[PDB]
């Protein structure tokens, strides 16, 4: 709605595959946590938002950027918002302006750690 | 909780990847719907529950059973509960006894329509 | 100059990366479907677009129906494609290499509903 | 009598079904890793168990660490396995065919954390 708590676990999945953002809000907050036991260098997760069209490009380039850049191309203009890459027992939050999004456009959230985006992706919709 | 509403969509995903069942309840109800536009013979979804150990065997045998058996081996003793296979606009509900489950055992829910179990799977735990 | 690709009953291609040599005039893709499932349940095509266009092609294809092989007719974003095949079938497509640009990211995928989740790979001209 | 399997940077094996002829005494699996990612990020092994035992092998292997190749040592459910490899590496494993039973469902998979979601296939003796 206005804020969502998302968990990325050791089973390589987020708790949810769909987020809806209330268009009447000015900002939207994503709180990311990592239940489980594996550290970020093996089962790291971030939360990255792009249009569905741009997802593939963001993932491909992020995979090539490495752990120390949180598997994201620095200053990637396609990334609307993102957290850092976290491991078990860590947390990160990102707040972004809702006007960065528009109705009728399809958005996807995903993890860019290599391989994870096959399962760790979902839709975000403005309503 | 005691009941959960689950949606399976045209993007081949359920809305959630984790369900928690309250141990104090006698029964648990899953309500499944299918938003979207594709019919069951193309983008059919069911909700099927087994232990994690048994999932592979249920999926493999279900795939071989065909559309008219809802992609499930009839009388499969590994299936704890399941809905029927539904397509867009349809709904099904299943209620099962919570004592069919035990604490400490890992359960998985999934769709057995050919190919779907790769992303349409999640964990179910008794708390 | 050609490649043999298989799409199976487990909703996967046997390769997720193709490199096309720029000195080639034409490139051929031979698609086969090992397995037992029919086209209506586990159909696969090989469709090529830029990486940026993939999502649009997939979404418009999904809406086009089985009768049109889940591909929008005359889709300008589609550089080349096979037909949609079932188990035991095969198809081949040949396209002109100069249609591709060196330095551009291209993707191949299946447009049957849901398949593109796993049935995708990259194609690059080198 | 042998098969060649590739595990890539896109977390997939190149085949998801192997059939072993029961007239063979031994069977050899040669595993390679195309791509560029290192073992710690995109490591792959080839591990064989019955289909009913897969989940237990994967779960216990996840907890065993990179230093043990994500496999519980002396796991009695593991029929055969390679070591965990990174890109540019190769390993082979040979196993006695009579260890497998005709009519049982076997699975091969990678035990690197999360990989088994996609890196799995069936193996049957015929
Ligand atoms: Cu991740
Ligand atoms: Cu389904
Ligand atoms: Cu397909
Ligand atoms: Cu692996």
Swiss-Prot record, chains A, B:
Q: Where is the Plastocyanin-like domain?
A: 1-127
Q: Where does Cu cation bind?
A: 45, 111, 116, 120
Any one GO CC term of this protein is: plasma membrane
Q: Where in the cell is it found?
A: Periplasm
Disulfides per UniProt: 2-25
**Where is it mainly found?**
periplasm
Keywords, A to Z, come to:
Copper, Disulfide bond, Electron transport, Metal-binding, Periplasm, Signal, Transport
Superkingdom of this entry's organism?
Bacteria
Extract the GO molecular function terms from the UniProt entry.
copper ion binding; electron transfer activity; identical protein binding; transition metal ion binding; zinc ion binding
Q: Which InterPro entries match?
A: Azurin (IPR014068), BlueCu_1 (IPR000923), BlueCu_1_BS (IPR028871), Cu-binding_ET (IPR050845), Cupredoxin (IPR008972)
- PANTHER family per UniProt: AURACYANIN-B, OUTER MEMBRANE PROTEIN H.8
Task: Briefly state the protein's biological role.
Answer: Transfers electrons from cytochrome c551 to cytochrome oxidase.
User: What NCBIfam families does the record point to?
Assistant: azurin
Task: Kindly provide the name given to this protein in its UniProt entry.
Answer: Azurin
Gene that encodes the chain: azu
């Amino acid at each position: 709605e206005s804020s969502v708590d998302i968990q990325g676990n050791d089973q390589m999945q987020f708790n949810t595959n769909a987020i809806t953002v209330d268009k009447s809000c000015k900002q939207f907050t994503v709180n990311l946590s990592h239940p489980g036991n594996l550290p970020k260098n093996v089962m790291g997760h971030n939360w990255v938002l792009s249009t569905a069209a741009d997802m593939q490009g963001v993932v491909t380039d992020g995979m090539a950027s490495g752990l120390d850049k949180d598997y994201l191309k620095p200053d990637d203009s396609r990334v609307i918002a993102h957290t850092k890459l976290i491991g078990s027992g860590e947390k990160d939050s990102v707040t972004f302006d809702v006007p960065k999004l528009k109705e009728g456009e399809q958005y996807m959230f995903f993890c860019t750690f290599p391989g994870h985006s096959a399962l760790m992706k979902g839709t975000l919709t403005l309503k």
